[PDB]
Amino acid sequence: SNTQTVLPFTGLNTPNGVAVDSAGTVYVTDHGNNRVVKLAAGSNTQTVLPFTGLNTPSGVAVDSAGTVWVTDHGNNRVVKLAAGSNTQTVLPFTGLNTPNGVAVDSAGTVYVTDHGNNRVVKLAAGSNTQTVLPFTGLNTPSGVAVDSAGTVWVTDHGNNRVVKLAAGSNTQTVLPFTGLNTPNGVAVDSAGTVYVTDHGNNRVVKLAAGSNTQTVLPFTGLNTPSGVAVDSAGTVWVTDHGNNRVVKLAA
To answer: Which of 87, 207, 213, 218 has the largest count of CB atoms under 10 Å?
Structure first.
């Protein structure tokens, strides 16, 4: 499509971070209200999830079991909410600083852009071992995506670039986007297409796998967009941070 739709969220404040599940339920970290909100497909009523004590949360992910993870940026922690019981567990990361961005894979491994420490960390399900990924030269990284193959992409915000660590490789690759300004947020689809919220240019850009020529998506009127998700259908959702809204574009 070339015409975006605004989702019927209410009362957002500087939202940053969006996730979508296979049912088309959309989850947003409503950063400036210290809460996580969700909207089911076709619904006008949003639901505030029972997280507690959040501070400027930035980034949300959801696994197959309905577990919701949030990077609780202002508290240097990652919290997960177990489905049904609504038990909150602080994941046993350590030493985080203003984390901003989270992803989870099929195995329940959790990946966090540890923004304030210029690093990306991962924690396997149930583990007390966190692993620093061998990205190099990061500056305030702010967004992480992982595909089915286990390739990890990161928006290296402070360097105006997107980097990837290909599965099985220990060598970082810089993707051939051009002209980025403080990018924050990355998503990847099944086809390997990469989507980035080019925050400081008020636009969303995408690169097909193997292509060296980005395209700009036909969103309009964005302001410091900061978070992107893509569903199985190729619909693209963006947290339009500076306009307190979430916008979507069908393929």
So the answer is: 207
Strand order in the sheet with 161-165: 144-146, 152-156, 161-165, 172-174
Residues 6+ apart with CB under 8 A from 167: 149, 150, 151
Dihedral sign from CA coordinates of 164, 167, 172, 175: negative
User: What DSSP line would sit under 11-51, residue for residue?
Assistant: S--S---EEE-TT--EEEEEGGGTEEEEE-TT-S--EE---
* Element containing residue 62 per DSSP (H, E): strand 60-62
Name 247's bridge partners.
6, 238
In the chain the domains, ranked by start, together with CATH numbers, are 5-249 (2.120.10.30)
User: Is the separation of the CB atoms in 178 and 136 below 8 Å?
Assistant: no
**Strand ranges in 65-134 using DSSP code E only, listed in sequence order:** 68-72, 77-81, 88-90, 102-104, 110-114, 119-123, 130-132
Residue 190, CA atoms < 13 Å, CB-side half-sphere: 5
CA-to-CA dists, residue 55 to 63, 94, 99, 116, angstroms: 22, 17, 11, 15
Q: Structure solved using which method?
A: X-ray
Q: Which residues contact residue 126 at a Cβ distance below 8 angstroms, ignoring those fewer than 6 apart? A: none
Q: Around Cβ 130, how many Cβ atoms within 10 Å?
A: 18
Length of the chain: 251
Residue type, 157: H
Token pair belonging to 207 = 């690169």
Closest to 195 (Cα-Cα) out of 217, 178, 167: 217
